[PDB]
């Protein structure tokens, strides 16, 4: 039941039980009916927290594994490698769960006219392919890097066709799309340019800020700016 599963997600959020939240929203999604704005954000929050935990754990154990390599301790490096790999498989599973929800239900069921939804979901596809790309190697890395770029690119073209430059969703897509260029592609100029253009297009059109989203728009403009100052310096 949809009310039941959604109630559960709201309570699980308050309680910071994010696996419980993600499982409830996966189920809501599997009903094959559209998600409202509220619902969409519930799904996004649940999974951002589930994968973020894994990403944080992955980075910490990767730092240990690098130090154990240089220390030259082969017996412990065996054990740190294995644990980092246990975490990776966890991380990859969350990302592919999300990416299957997107591919099988959410993007699939979008009208040629539900542009806000499509952008939101293709951004999401870019994000989780990007999280896969943070830990991937070789040919598997190539594939998920291309997958990430292709979803970000489609999302961003629709958003320029159908959304005002101050729209929070278009702005946060620009933000994550620039981050992808900077840290996944090691392409700092391409990252800076896309970030700068977004900030610039928003400012040209402050007249398009709405009552219900001006605060989020301005927050994200400042995050774009923050990144450009770090990156240019």
């Amino acid at each position: 039941d949809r009310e039941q599963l959604l109630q559960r997600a709201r309570l699980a959020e308050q309680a910071e039980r994010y696996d419980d939240m993600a499982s409830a929203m996966k189920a809501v999604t599997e009903l094959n009916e559209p998600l409202s704005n509220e619902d969409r954000n519930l799904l996004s929050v649940a999974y951002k927290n589930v994968v973020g935990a894994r990403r944080s754990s992955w980075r910490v154990i990767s730092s240990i594994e690098q130090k154990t390599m240089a220390d030259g301790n082969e017996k412990k490096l065996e054990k740190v490698k294995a644990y980092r790999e246990k975490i990776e498989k966890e991380l990859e599973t969350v990302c592919n769960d999300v990416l299957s929800l997107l591919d099988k239900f959410l993007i699939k069921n979008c009208n040629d006219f539900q542009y806000e939804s499509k952008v939101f979901y293709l951004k999401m596809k870019g994000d989780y392919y990007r999280y896969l790309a943070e830990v991937a190697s070789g040919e598997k890395k190539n594939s998920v890097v291309e997958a990430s770029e292709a979803a970000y690119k489609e999302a961003f073209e629709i958003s320029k066709e159908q959304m005002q430059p101050t729209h929070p969703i278009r702005l946060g897509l620009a933000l994550n799309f620039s981050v992808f260029y900077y840290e996944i592609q090691n392409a700092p100029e391409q990252a800076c340019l896309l970030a700068k253009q977004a900030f610039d297009d928003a400012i040209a059109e402050l007249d398009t800020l709405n009552e219900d989203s001006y605060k989020d728009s301005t927050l994200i403009m400042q995050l774009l700016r923050d990144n450009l100052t770090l990156w240019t310096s």
Binding site: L175, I220, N227
Partner: peptide
């Protein structure tokens, strides 16, 4: 910093 990606979107919170």
């Amino acid at each position: 910093i990606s979107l919170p």
